């Protein structure tokens, strides 16, 4: 038995009007903790707001789309609770209009494209991003962060930012978004489908 401990903490994020912003929050604990989201100290609920859980509810993603300048700029609080305790952490979201975009704001030079892969073959989703400084690349699959570290080497992210999936399986099917993040902000690629076809 132990109090919840954050192992993924949402960071401040600067997004683009009409785009997407995801906050990820995860904790460990025994019993397994539950994650709850708040905006301005109130639980979330909108047509533009989606909450996707993972890790049996010990992980959670707040996804906002499309980002709207007026209403989405706010402080979002993540709370992790079990019978032993409660912890929390907040992050600010900023949303820029197109004309407020600094010159080095990340760009999607070449996004991932639709991919049909033979079962047990290796699939590779590409993502070439630009910007100044050089952006960091992460991936979401059906709105959830892809964590290569938990795949036992089967899934890995290349230094080009590409996601390489070996021994493709039924579960690898879904829509993949690549995300480019700078000190200037975050930009999502269009989603691309990965299908697994019978050999």
What this model shows, in words?
This protein is 2% helix and 54% strand. With 199 residues, the protein is mainly β. It folds into two domains: 98 residues, Immunoglobulin-like, CATH 2.60.40; 101 residues, Sandwich (Immunoglobulin-like), CATH 2.60.40.10. Strands 11, 14, 15, 18, 19 and 20 form a six-stranded mixed sheet that branches. A hairpin with a 4-residue loop joins strand 18 and strand 19. The chain starts with a strand and ends with a strand. Belongs to the protein-tyrosine phosphatase family. Receptor class 2A subfamily. Possible cell adhesion receptor. It possesses an intrinsic protein tyrosine phosphatase activity (PTPase) and dephosphorylates EPHA2 regulating its activity. Interacts with GRIP1. Interacts with PPFIA1, PPFIA2 and PPFIA3. Interacts with INSR.
Helices and strands in order, then pairings?
Blueprint: E1 2-8, E2 13-16, E3 21-30, E4 34-39, E5 42-43, E6 49-54, E7 59-64, H1 69-72, E8 74-82, E9 85-96, E10 107-110, E11 115-118, E12 123-125, E13 128-130, E14 136-141, E15 144-145, E16 155-157, E17 163-165, E18 174-181, E19 186-188, E20 192-197
Parallel strand pairs: 2-9, 11-20
Antiparallel strand pairs: 1-3, 3-7, 4-5, 4-8, 6-7, 8-9, 10-13, 12-17, 14-15, 14-18, 16-17, 18-19, 18-20
